[PDB]
Design a protein around this ligand. Structure first.
Ligand SMILES: CC(C)(COP(=O)(O)OP(=O)(O)OC[C@H]1O[C@@H](n2cnc3c(N)ncnc32)[C@H](O)[C@@H]1OP(=O)(O)O)[C@@H](O)C(=O)NCCC(=O)NCCS
Lengths: 305, 420, 420
């Protein structure tokens, strides 16, 4: 199944990266930032403007040409939301080992079309859309993330909201526990990555001793993560995990319509989420201001420091 | 619960969705729109001058329990002569509907829907909805229409039939017959149900919809199943390629601040507090709300500037928070990332200089440009109260809100500056 | 509120009143009674094997909100085939209905009513009721049927038309047309409404009824107004000359103690307390309840022996109070008058001697024979605890109830006697 690409998440310091939509404003700026950080960017792709040299690196008309000219093993996407679905289809067709798309505003139907053929293939893993990116601290950052607060350590952070992902990154760096892998799966309901993949990549990795799990109200991915951690992270030899639930105190909602809202869902996104989190042995924080202190307290309680 | 914070999905008035179903060929009761009692009279006499139903076109959770300023119960009425139709319409059009969702800031009923009244024999609920569990569209059907569906779904999960659909191969008529026969359709009108579901799915795929709820799909007293309600929740992201649907958006149903925010691609969330904010990303917005509520405060109306917004966007943002008078202390809590922090520093400089923002701006700026932002803040030389810890920022802003509301009581003026 | 204490007016099952309307010529949907699923099948296939309604024949305030032991919601169901009619009837007949009025002692649904399902166009409420304000029968009519009528009557008193009738001259058809046209009938079916009201008034005068409520009287989709519900509250006093109606009284809907009390002309009122009583007249019954509740007690089940009852009546009374086990201390509080107190003294003597009444009988006897009653009590030489002050009697009986329930806890036995 497509799940066989789970191990593609953990990029190392030898991961060659291309950037589709190179000439785009955000594309150019964050390509500059990634090159400054040390990301092994090896070129970009722009339709109708490729075949040239920009930023000192080649640009091609298609991901086919970039793959056959450089053999890059991952791609990032900054094309406009109208054309993002076609770019992701082209990236998946080119057999890119890891494709991450950052764009926000993708129509749901086009993302359905993308996700279906993604699930009918086993050799490509997608991160996004509406995601911050994926980073291996000190080795390689991909997407949109402030690498100037990242240090290699023993914390694995996966979260939906990219901005709160950054907040957790900073609050783990402040206490000095470092970071092992930080992934934003993205809040969009139709995304290429979910909680289960990141959690089990973190569990079977020796470099990570503590997992950070920030989720928001709405949906049921947190319940699936809680069930997974109950199944595979219980009893002895279970690395501690700390979770936050953004929106614990919030207005009830809008309650526009029935069906897809509550009928076929797990009616989650409320005070019952945190209960599923304690029931799975996950330590929860009551405020987004003490995640780093909470994980430090969990390490010192079990005496890993 | 639900989403609320992230995006306000476009909900059309009933008559627009009814027209959309009409043009798609879906079997539907005859319906028209009335803006004044005169054409209400004309349509009532056109439909037979008897057995007519009048519906209010107000976007709210409560429509049959609401109250008008004129003193009428509910948004639906059953009239039997065009004269009483005019009489009741005169108490709807131009009137303000009070429902529990609005509380006191009720929306105004601009138009009404005039329809023929048909007697249903059986009441089915039906819904084509995009969903992540089945990785695509899902046809949900049940024989408990006309009644709230969550209760029967929770108490009797078996009665709610759910069938997924493969998008690349489309929908197959055999699937529609299967759904109709599993709901319990009469064996003589199953073909009509299948045709209606096929047309509804074609409409669902065409207009970039997200959830088409027909509740209740009812068989008439003479066959030829007719849809009664046609709730449609669309996709916010589909604005670029669905121009016809999104142009017909009704803007009277939201505050003018909401309209102004949408004019510049800024998410806006009003509340009942007195601490304004300006947050990058919904997640940190809920984080800021939770941390403020921890310290005894309550956010007033906070925004979301998205990613890559220009300086004019944040200038309009600050104009928008300062427009409300219930705000006392404003915190800009933007962490870096896609949204280049230096443009926000420039925006705060310009907006405080221009609009004379005398309220304590408890800034907290980080990410991908900290040197430029802090350097610009220091160069501008204002009361831009810098902070760099989330908990400390929340503590400071809550205390500043209390100080401001206390000094207003004392009838004295204060000025806030960083400790030397 | 209401009467409750004074008399339990005969309420028939729905099908009996429907039959009574049928024999009177009132326009009425076709209906039949089913005692088993077999004849339910037969009637369903007789009416067309489709579009059938099933109603539960249970005498309770809540019938659409009640619950069966089998786990079905409400007492009304809409079936479309005789097979599912049998299936649902198998979950009604022989089953116990749980409503809020019963709480836990629900009545059992013995039969069901199978009727044709008709689509109403307009819903009118109508009621012929005897009343003291208009010194006779009153025709009440409104156009708010199908919904609870007290709310609209209180909020909109004008909408409830009330017209009195002169009994000696009878009812006049012109009055019926006036009522129909003031409610707002269509001008083509007013004659049918007048005929229906005339027939209903003839039934009202014939069967010695007290209140005939048709809610809702509904025009059909093809004219020919048809009554849906036909609630009839009769007159208790009319038992002597209305034999047919009162013989059809259903006795399963009340406790066997109630049936036994009615067999001897004794009013019975059960409660949730633990101090039995035996009171002459309803007024002193409420007085005794109030005075017991003043002293912290609560009456358990108290009676009303009427006037001129024989000694056997009060013997059966004491048997009836002692039948319940929740009673602890019994007070006979009869003041004199029509009920000759000496026969009650004889009755207490006989009943305590026979049934071995070991519970403290706090008697309080007065009126028109005090010498004979007290002399008989003293001659019998028992634990018949005499008292002669109402407040003192209530104090004594409440304290004795507490003593009895305390000694039961202590697992010790006590005997009560007058102070020397
Ligand atoms: C991703 C995003 C930055 C791209 O738009 P932008 O950079 O603002 O604007 P651009 O016009 O540069 O983006 C499209 C660029 O890709 C090029 N392009 C066209 N087709 C393309 C394709 N199929 N694949 C890649 N690039 C393509 C365009 O020519 C353009 O380059 P140009 O500017 O030199 O002409 C923007 O859509 C965005 O806002 N980001 C995604 C959502 C968001 O708000 N940010 C991240 C959320 S966490």
């Amino acid at each position: 199944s497509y799940t066989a690409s789970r191990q593609h998440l953990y990029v190392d310091k030898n991961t060659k990266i291309i950037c589709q939509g190179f000439t785009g404003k955000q594309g150019t700026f964050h390509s500059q930032q990634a090159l400054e950080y040390g990301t092994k960017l090896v070129g970009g792709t722009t339709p109708g403007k490729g075949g040239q040299t920009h930023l000192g690196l080649p640009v091609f008309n298609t991901v086919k040409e970039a793959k056959e000219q450089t053999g890059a093993t991952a791609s990032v996407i900054y094309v406009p939301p109208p054309f993002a679905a076609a770019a992701i289809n082209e990236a998946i067709e080119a057999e890119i080992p890891l494709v991450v798309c950052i764009t926000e505003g993708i129509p749901q139907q086009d993302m359905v079309r993308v996700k279906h053929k993604l699930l009918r293939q086993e050799k490509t893993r997608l991160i996004g859309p509406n995601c911050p990116g994926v980073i291996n601290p000190g080795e390689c950052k991909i997407g949109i993330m402030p690498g100037h607060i990242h240090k290699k350590g023993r914390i694995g952070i996966v979260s939906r909201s990219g901005t709160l992902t950054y907040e957790a990154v900073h609050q783990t760096t402040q206490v000095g526990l470092g970071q092992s892998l930080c992934v934003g799966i993205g809040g969009d309901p139709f995304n290429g990555t979910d909680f289960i993949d990141c959690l089990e990549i973190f569990l079977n990795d020796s470099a990570t001793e503590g997992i950070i799990l920030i989720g928001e109200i709405g949906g049921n991915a947190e319940e699936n993560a809680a069930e997974f951690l109950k199944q595979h992270n219980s009893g002895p030899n279970s690395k501690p995990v700390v979770s936050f639930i953004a929106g614990l105190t919030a207005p009830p909602g809008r309650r526009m319509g029935h069906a897809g809202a509550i009928i076929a869902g797990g009616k989650g996104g409320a005070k019952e989420k945190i209960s599923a989190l304690q029931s799975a042995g996950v330590v929860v924080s009551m405020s987004p201001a003490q995640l780093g202190t909470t994980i430090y307290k969990e390490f010192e309680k079990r005496k890993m420091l | 619960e639900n989403l609320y914070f992230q995006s306000m999905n476009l909900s059309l008035h009933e008559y627009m969705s009814m027209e959309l179903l009409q043009e798609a060929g879906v079997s539907v009761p005859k319906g028209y729109v009335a803006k004044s009692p005169d054409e209400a009279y004309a349509i009532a006499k056109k439909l037979g001058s008897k057995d007519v139903v009048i519906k209010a076109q107000v976007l709210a959770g409560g429509r049959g329990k609401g109250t008008f300023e004129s003193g009428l119960k509910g948004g639906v009425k059953i009239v039997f002569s065009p004269e009483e139709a005019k009489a009741v319409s005169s108490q709807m059009i131009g009137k303000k509907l009070f429902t529990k969702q609005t509380g006191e800031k009720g929306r105004i009923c601009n138009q009404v829907l005039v329809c023929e009244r048909k007697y249903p024999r059986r009441e089915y609920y039906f819904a084509i909805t995009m969903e992540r569990s089945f990785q695509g569209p899902v046809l949900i059907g049940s024989s408990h229409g006309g009644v709230n569906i969550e209760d029967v779904a929770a108490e009797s999960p078996e009665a709610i039939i759910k069938e997924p659909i493969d998008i690349e191969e489309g929908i197959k008529k055999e699937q529609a017959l299967q759904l109709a026969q599993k709901m319990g359709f009469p064996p003589n009108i199953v073909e009509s149900a299948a045709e209606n579901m096929v047309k509804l799915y074609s409409l669902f795929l065409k207009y970039d919809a997200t959830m088409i709820e027909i509740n209740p799909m009812v068989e008439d007293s003479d066959g030829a199943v007719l849809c009664m309600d046609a709730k449609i929740n669309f996709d916010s992201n589909s604005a670029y390629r669905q121009k016809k649907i999104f142009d017909l958006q009704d803007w009277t149903q939201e505050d003018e601040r909401d309209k102004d925010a949408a004019k510049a691609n800024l998410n806006y969330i009003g509340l009942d507090g007195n601490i304004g904010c300006l947050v990058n990303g919904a997640g940190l917005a809920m984080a800021t709300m939770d941390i403020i509520k921890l310290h005894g405060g309550t956010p007033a109306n906070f925004l979301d500037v998205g990613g890559g917004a220009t300086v004019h966007q944040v200038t309009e943002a600050f104009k928008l928070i300062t427009s409300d008078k219930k705000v006392l202390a404003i915190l800009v809590n933007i962490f870096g990332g896609i949204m280049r922090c230096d443009v926000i520093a420039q925006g705060i400089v310009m907006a405080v200089k221009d609009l004379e923002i005398k309220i304590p701006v408890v800034v907290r700026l980080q990410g991908t440009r900290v040197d430029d932002a802090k350097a610009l803040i220091a160069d501008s030389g204002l009361k831009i109260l810098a902070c760099d810890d989330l908990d400390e920022a929340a503590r400071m802003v809550v205390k500043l809100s209390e100080i401001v509301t206390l000094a207003k009581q004392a009838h004295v003026d204060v000025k806030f500056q960083l400790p030397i």
